[model samples]
Target: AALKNYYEVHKELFEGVQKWEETWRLFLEFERKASDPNRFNLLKEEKQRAKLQKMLPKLEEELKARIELWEQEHSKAFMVNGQKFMEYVAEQWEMHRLEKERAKQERQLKNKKQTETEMLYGS
Candidate 1:
């Protein structure tokens, strides 16, 4: 039910990996509102901003819990499909690789400077 609607409305607030808790909350909210016929429409930008700001960390924790649950269960299907999961995992891998490469480059630069100093100072 929720999974079906998630596919229909893949709003994906952020790019790259699927932010677990936020995404789940979005789906849950959609389901609740969509199922509710007498829902109120309040248009308060400041309130909405604060709500989202508060929600971000909660969503992050939700993501962490969900990941932990997945790990505890060992890749068991928890609604989302393989295609979406694979794409997110690949994106994460690419990001991780880039970070490592940058760190290595920085280390190499430091080493190069140290080598020059050693050659000049004979130590």
Candidate 2:
């Protein structure tokens, strides 16, 4: 089932669920302060701003995926389109969303981490 598979693949993400909550809190803070018309460039640091920008899609993708998977696994409950069909389609969409988001984050973090390491190593 999609739920089972999702849990298996993203067990860490799903575990305790505190990560998502914290991510959301941070998201709201950034969005509100950054979008304030009066405060231009409220996020002072380039790296920190970039970090928040990167986090947007990460949060969006995760939420979208979870929502899609839930809808698919419980599609039968939704009689809006009455019929037997492949419920896993939505699940796959969610799976891909998570994959893309994670990959981008992974790449960015890797690059940033490497840069930080090199700076510290004076190399």
Candidate 3:
């Protein structure tokens, strides 16, 4: 709900958020391939390489679908090099953080009330 509300107000900020998530996923995959010793050896194997090749086309199609959906929903292409886009994403993150903090406070208040009740009455 909090994230939905944030995005509702910051619709233009959507592109960066989605792009960041996709980029982060790719970054993690890159890290796994780079740092994982076993992964290098696995990639060298004919069967493993073939399996990845087989999946590549499907991944490409899925990526195209996601790109199209993103453009349709946001009504804009993703930011390739925009300072304002970075700021927009940062603001969205701040809003999300504030929402999380608000929820935490609410939970603390409820817990405190429950504790007070237990103190006054028997648990």
Candidate 4:
């Protein structure tokens, strides 16, 4: 099951590669390895072994990238308020309101300073 899942998830990594003539056979070997953990030496052909060698690292890299992407998407879950379905509706509203008020205060201060400068310069 684990081997099958790994194959399914990382199948795209095998694309554009014309190394494995019998892809299904390669997966069957993987499935056999799943059933028997001690089955270290499965690939009989040197080409098969070479392809496996080249593709395994790419598969590992792709899997890590996918996991990182998933983590990045869910990394903000703690800030949201929910058990199952996370939502940040109220928090977003409050944050936007605060930002607007801060911008407004900055603009008001700038206007006040400009007015004071004009008055002092007699212009």
Number of the top TM-score candidate: 3
Instruction: List where candidate 3 sits over 4 angstroms from the true fold.
Output: 1-18, 21-83
Query: All candidates' TM-scores?
Result: 0.32, 0.33, 0.36, 0.31
Any idea what lDDT model 3 has?
0.55
- The residue pairs found clashing in candidate 3 are none
Please report, as a residue range, the 10-residue window in candidate 1 with the lowest summed lDDT. Answer: 8-17
Ranking by TM-score: 3, 2, 1, 4
Model 3: per-residue lDDT, tens digit, 1-123? Answer: 887874553443454446555654454355346443355355555444455545544544554565466667778764535634444445654775686677668878988998999999965
Candidate 1 C-alpha lDDT tens digits along 25-106 = 4544543443343554444534554565566557555544554555455454433445445445446447656866776688
lDDT of 4: 0.48
lDDT of 1 at 71: 44
For residues 1-123, could you state the per-residue lDDT of candidate 2 as single tens digits?
A: 877876563344343245545654565466445444355544354456568668756765665565556557656232213421224334434665686677668878888998999899964
List where candidate 1 sits over 4 angstroms from the true fold.
1-83
- Compute the lDDT of residue 15 as modeled in candidate 3: 49
Q: Of the pair 1 and 3, which is ahead by lDDT?
A: 3
Stretch of 10 with least lDDT, candidate 3: 31-40
Top lDDT: which candidate number?
Answer: 3
All models: lDDT?
0.52, 0.54, 0.55, 0.48
lDDT of 3 at 123: 53
